[PDB]
Amino acid sequence: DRPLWLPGSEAPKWLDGSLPGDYGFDPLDLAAEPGRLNWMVQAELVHCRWAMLGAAGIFIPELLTKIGILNTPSWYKAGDATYFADQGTLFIVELLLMAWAESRRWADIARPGSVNTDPIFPNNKLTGTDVGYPGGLWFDPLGWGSGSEDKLKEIRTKEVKNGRLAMLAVLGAFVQANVTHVGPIDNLFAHLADPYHTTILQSL
Amino acid sequence: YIGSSTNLIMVASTTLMLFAGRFGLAPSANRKSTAGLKLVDRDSGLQTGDPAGFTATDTLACGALGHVIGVGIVLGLKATA
Amino acid sequence: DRPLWFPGSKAPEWLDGSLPGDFGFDPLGLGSDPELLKWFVQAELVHCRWAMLGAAGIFIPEALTKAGILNTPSWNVAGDQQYFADPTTLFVIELILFAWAEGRRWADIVNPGCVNVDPVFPNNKLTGTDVGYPGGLWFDPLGWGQTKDAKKLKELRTKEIKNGRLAMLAVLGAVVQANYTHTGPIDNLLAHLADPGHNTIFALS
Amino acid sequence: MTGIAEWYKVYGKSVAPDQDARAPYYGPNRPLWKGPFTKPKDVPEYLKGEYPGDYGCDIFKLARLPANYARLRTQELMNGRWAMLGITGCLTPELINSNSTPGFEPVWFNTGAQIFSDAGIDYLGVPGFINAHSLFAVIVVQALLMGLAEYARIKFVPEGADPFYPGGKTFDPLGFSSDPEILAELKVKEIKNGRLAMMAMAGLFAQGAVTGVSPLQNLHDWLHL
Amino acid sequence: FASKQSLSYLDGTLPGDYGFDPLGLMDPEGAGGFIDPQWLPYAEIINGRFAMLGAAGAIAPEVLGRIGLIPQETAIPWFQSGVIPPVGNYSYWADPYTLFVLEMALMGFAEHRRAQDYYKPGSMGKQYFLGLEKFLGGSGNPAYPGGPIFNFLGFGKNEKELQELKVKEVKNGRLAMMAVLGYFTQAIFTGVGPFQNLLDHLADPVHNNVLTNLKI
Numbered sequence A: 001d002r003p004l005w006l007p008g009s010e011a012p013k014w015l016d017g018s019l020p021g022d023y024g025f026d027p028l029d030l031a032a033e034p035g036r037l038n039w040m041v042q043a044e045l046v047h048c049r050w051a052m053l054g055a056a057g058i059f060i061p062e063l064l065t066k067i068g069i070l071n072t073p074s075w076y077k078a079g080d081a082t083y084f085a086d087q088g089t090l091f092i093v094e095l096l097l098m099a100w101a102e103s104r105r106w107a108d109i110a111r112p113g114s115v116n117t118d119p120i121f122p123n124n125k126l127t128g129t130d131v132g133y134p135g136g137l138w139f140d141p142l143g144w145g146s147g148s149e150d151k152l153k154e155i156r157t158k159e160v161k162n163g164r165l166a167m168l169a170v171l172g173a174f175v176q177a178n179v180t181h182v183g184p185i186d187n188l189f190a191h192l193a194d195p196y197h198t199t200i201l202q203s204l
Numbered sequence B: 001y002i003g004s005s006t007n008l009i010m011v012a013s014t015t016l017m018l019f020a021g022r023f024g025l026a027p028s029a030n031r032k033s034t035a036g037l038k039l040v041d042r043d044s045g046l047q048t049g050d051p052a053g054f055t056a057t058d059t060l061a062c063g064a065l066g067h068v069i070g071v072g073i074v075l076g077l078k079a080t081a
Numbered sequence C: 001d002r003p004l005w006f007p008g009s010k011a012p013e014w015l016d017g018s019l020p021g022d023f024g025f026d027p028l029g030l031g032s033d034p035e036l037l038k039w040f041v042q043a044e045l046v047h048c049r050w051a052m053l054g055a056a057g058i059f060i061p062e063a064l065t066k067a068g069i070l071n072t073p074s075w076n077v078a079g080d081q082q083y084f085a086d087p088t089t090l091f092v093i094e095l096i097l098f099a100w101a102e103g104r105r106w107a108d109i110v111n112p113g114c115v116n117v118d119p120v121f122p123n124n125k126l127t128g129t130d131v132g133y134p135g136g137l138w139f140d141p142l143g144w145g146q147t148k149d150a151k152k153l154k155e156l157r158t159k160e161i162k163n164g165r166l167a168m169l170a171v172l173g174a175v176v177q178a179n180y181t182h183t184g185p186i187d188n189l190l191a192h193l194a195d196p197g198h199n200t201i202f203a204l205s
Numbered sequence D: 001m002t003g004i005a006e007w008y009k010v011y012g013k014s015v016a017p018d019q020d021a022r023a024p025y026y027g028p029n030r031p032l033w034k035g036p037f038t039k040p041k042d043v044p045e046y047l048k049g050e051y052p053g054d055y056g057c058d059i060f061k062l063a064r065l066p067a068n069y070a071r072l073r074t075q076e077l078m079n080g081r082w083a084m085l086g087i088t089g090c091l092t093p094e095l096i097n098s099n100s101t102p103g104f105e106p107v108w109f110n111t112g113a114q115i116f117s118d119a120g121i122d123y124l125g126v127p128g129f130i131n132a133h134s135l136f137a138v139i140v141v142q143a144l145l146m147g148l149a150e151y152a153r154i155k156f157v158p159e160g161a162d163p164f165y166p167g168g169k170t171f172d173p174l175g176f177s178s179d180p181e182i183l184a185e186l187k188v189k190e191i192k193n194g195r196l197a198m199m200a201m202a203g204l205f206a207q208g209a210v211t212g213v214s215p216l217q218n219l220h221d222w223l224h225l
Numbered sequence E: 001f002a003s004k005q006s007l008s009y010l011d012g013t014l015p016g017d018y019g020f021d022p023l024g025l026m027d028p029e030g031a032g033g034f035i036d037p038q039w040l041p042y043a044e045i046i047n048g049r050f051a052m053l054g055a056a057g058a059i060a061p062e063v064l065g066r067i068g069l070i071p072q073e074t075a076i077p078w079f080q081s082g083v084i085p086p087v088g089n090y091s092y093w094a095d096p097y098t099l100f101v102l103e104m105a106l107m108g109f110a111e112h113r114r115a116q117d118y119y120k121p122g123s124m125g126k127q128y129f130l131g132l133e134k135f136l137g138g139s140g141n142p143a144y145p146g147g148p149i150f151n152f153l154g155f156g157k158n159e160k161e162l163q164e165l166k167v168k169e170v171k172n173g174r175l176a177m178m179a180v181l182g183y184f185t186q187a188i189f190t191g192v193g194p195f196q197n198l199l200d201h202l203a204d205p206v207h208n209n210v211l212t213n214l215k216i
Ligand SMILES: CC(/C=C/C=C(C)/C=C/[C@@]12O[C@]1(C)C[C@@H](O)CC2(C)C)=C\C=C\C=C(C)\C=C\C=C(C)\C=C\[C@@]12O[C@]1(C)C[C@@H](O)CC2(C)C
Pocket: C025, C026, C027, C028, C029, C030, C031, C047, C050, C051, C052, C053, C054, C055, C057, C058, C075, C076, C078, C079, C167, C168, C169, C171, C172
């Protein structure tokens, strides 16, 4: 009684549908391995969350600049721009901080509920009871979302499909920067100016 | 050079020698010739995939004899003609 | 019994007459497999419907152009005319729009009734039961096609498929005759009405 | 069991004398249409072997009924035999003489228009050979001779022999069909060489459509030598 | 299971055994000297491992130079590094003969120790080496010593995976032996590096083969 991504299409046996967003869409038969499904769901969560973060960080500056509130440079040349700190130094700081963060995440994934305790101050005790959703004061301050059964399903579906939308949108933005030398919203303006003569087939 | 007369003579000599080897028109490892040139059967402990009994030893021997005959014919024809 | 295409000859065993317009014409035995008949009837329905559309579009505008009330250009050069939009853009737009229809058609022919529900508003549906006949408000505006058929539906189906086959022959005739003669179908019609014997296949070559 | 027999058995048999000519081509041991990645599902449960040259390749739901399978086997055999004849006859005149001798026209897809020329069709470019100049006569002779041949095929069956493997004295003068085992092996060989010829004919059609001729595109191009 | 007759002594227990022995070199009837059946598999494995090292190291510098990792002063072909001074020479921190003496010293230690372990299986772990004699006691088969140094990661813990690894080692070793022979012959005929030969066969396959290079 669960809608499928394709009407009248039989869902894969392993794709039960209990997990949020499971619409029986696995054409490549990739997730049939017993040990791969958890890795797939965690990877999709991380991918969608970082993709939507990057989607905000890309779309908001260009939109604000074209409105007029801000006067920030574009994303596809920001790396080659004047900064107080050297680019390599910043990158090393980034990789170190992310090494700590993901190391914690990887330890959580491999060993369930093993790194919920803060070493320096053992009086924190993260509250998350599911892998990939640690919650806690640092990551879930207000406490929204956590409720009864079938309440988490709809909001997690919202999260995963919003992340999918943002991820495909950011792929589109990168493809734009590869094909046109201007921001995607300016391409929206161009598509609005002459819609029947401005599309993908026009200047492929 | 591929279509040249020398190439044709060499390939023809080698092919004819191999043909006379695989089919019982010439001596080989599994087919001994007697004093009367009769080609009696001989059993050798050599295993081959060819159902007729043609082995790699026979392939090498027939190819060598074919190259020899072809070289002789080519040089003789060049000297005469 | 039924009027066969060839009098006095046994009809193919796989054609019982239940399907509309069964003339028992299978000289090459291309319908020996029962599961192939369903696909073949669906394909012939789709070509015959599109062929009736094409015959109307190639004959009525040209006939009214001959009458003078319309200025429709010759259909052979219609695709080379200038239009406000890119023809390839038009192709991709119609492709995208028709992809949903093709998906619906594939889903229903593989599994009848699985796409009979309106997604946005589930209340809206279609009343069809036979495979390839949806009825409903969208596809049957006049409510024609859902009737107790003792002799009602079958005659309509038979004349529908007969007109479809005639239009199929007509459109391939038009394409062929335009290829052979660099003139519109109405020119050939006038030539055959003026002197049928003089103007013919051998007349041009 | 003529002299050609036991000679094919010693030399022309494709398997060693100890092993029968059945197992490599019939039964559950067939190579199958995906090689070592075939998997049990991709072989239809009705394509169990027991017929020449089957690799369990029915991606569409054809056959599945014995009558369709037997028929399709018969058209496959006929198209294959005609394709063998066609490919060898398309490649022989170009091999013997690639020059454009006026009455010759070696190119396989251009010999049709040679009849309408003044020189006509001169077999081997010999002025006195046939020298035909009328297409209608060729049409009539084709119709009569092939109608007689096919009428004899589908009506003059000896009622005791196979419709497509008549054998007998007239169609097997050398008596290759003495042994059923070598007969099945020869049927496998015939099917495979016929399929190869059929693909050769299809590729010949395509490459004639795109590129010029057969010798060129094999000696002119792709084999720069 | 392939190649030639099953010689009735190549039953199949050896890794990489396919009964290929046309000359009957491994027949155990008269098996003295270096033609002992217990020496030939070991020798095959040893020229094979050295050939794997040699092929990888003779093709690596030129590929790295083409990509750009290493300075182009060191991207010279394998025969232009000092093996054959008449062909080409490179200047290192020592002249090649001092390098040869040092190499012979180190390889003499290693190889005479390995030989003593082959001939006296339990030895090399008894007398006092400089603390490392504990890890240098080869377990069982001389060709597969193992231990906390020669197998310091722990592969092949079970027997079947070890069999697969042994078979893989034998095939890569035989392939590398043939590759090194090809390196030698192609160096003699073409006068350029094997990677350049590969690029030449790729650019114009029909006009850049052994038949064209008959004239040097
Ligand atoms: C006739 C036809 C097919 C005929 C098939 C036959 C006889 C099959 C017969 C048999 O199989 C049976 C039944 C049963 C078997 O046992 C035996 C045989 C004997 C084998 C298809 C028609 C098909 C006809 C169709 C689909 C018509 C399409 C119309 C189009 C494309 C219009 C195009 C244009 O709009 C554009 C694009 C733009 C501008 O150019 C303007 C126009 C020209 C208006």
